[PDB]
Amino acid sequence: NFIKTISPIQKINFNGFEFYIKRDDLLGEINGNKARKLAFYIHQRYPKNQSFVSYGGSQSNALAALSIFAKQRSYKLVFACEKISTFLKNNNYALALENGVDFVENIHSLSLKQFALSLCKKDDVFIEQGIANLEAQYGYMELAQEIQMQSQSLKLDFDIFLPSGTGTSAAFLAKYSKFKVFTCACVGDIKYLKKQILTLDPSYDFSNLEFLTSDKKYHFAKPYKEFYELYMDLKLKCNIEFDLLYDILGLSIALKQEWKKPLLYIHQGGILGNSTMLERY
Secondary structure: OOOOOOOOEEEEEEOOEEEEEEOHHHOOOOOHHHHHHOHHHHHOOOOOOOEEEEEOOOOOHHHHHHHHHHHHOOOEEEEEEEOOOHHHHHOOHHHHHHOOOEEEEEOOOOOHHHHHHHOOOOOOEEOOHHHOOHHHHHHHHHHHHHHHHHHHHHOOOOEEEOOEOOOHHHHHHHHHOOOOEEEOEOOOOHHHHHHHHHHHOOOOOHHHEEEOOOOOOOOOOOOOHHHHHHHHHHHHHHOOOOOOOOHHHHHHHHOOOOOOOOEEEEOOOOHHHHHHHHHHO
16 A cells, blocks of 8 residues: 655634644654654665764754654664753653663763764764754755645645744745745744854855744743643644644744735644643643
């Protein structure tokens, strides 16, 4: 059997404003943003027991996604990180531990990227923190192609919105979509976000990427009453759970804009990471 699907586009009415959600949270055990970024690696056919080296937060969505990617394919994941809290060691990190990730701690408190790169032997594959690399663009070429087909099937000319951390996903979706892509800076400000994108691709053309501001300054990973309420409303009334770190801010901004085209909101997935944020709520 050959079977293929693409994530569906779902219609939602929020206080009379009808818009569309690209349900990338339904892509599978690996879903959402990091599933799109992993498309390049999933399409490769690496030798058995291939080793992968990455780094970043011990509770990060990328860690969780990479651990599943490696476990499904009998690859190995080496994950460098800052010296982990004693409390956390004894008590996404749990899922990565269960998937057999080889954690290597930055005992000498050095530059975590340099530390990680140094562990990368010949024949190992290095994957930048958060998969914030050029390889990540192929999954967003794929996402752009899916949206191209689905937009035509609906005869809708969309404006697309997705929230940013490093801006990698939004930059590459805007690179390949015919539709205008809108984003927001969940980490830092818009100046910082442009700087990250230009570090990723110094030749990047911002002609198809627009940046929206929130009318309130929200600090990354801090809890906000209005975010919890929106999260719970979307969960209880629509059975759609969103990530509380990026997507709930992104939705909050998108829902305050006046859109001149139908809006397609890209679900970022990562709801298994909500364990940590919900504790703060």
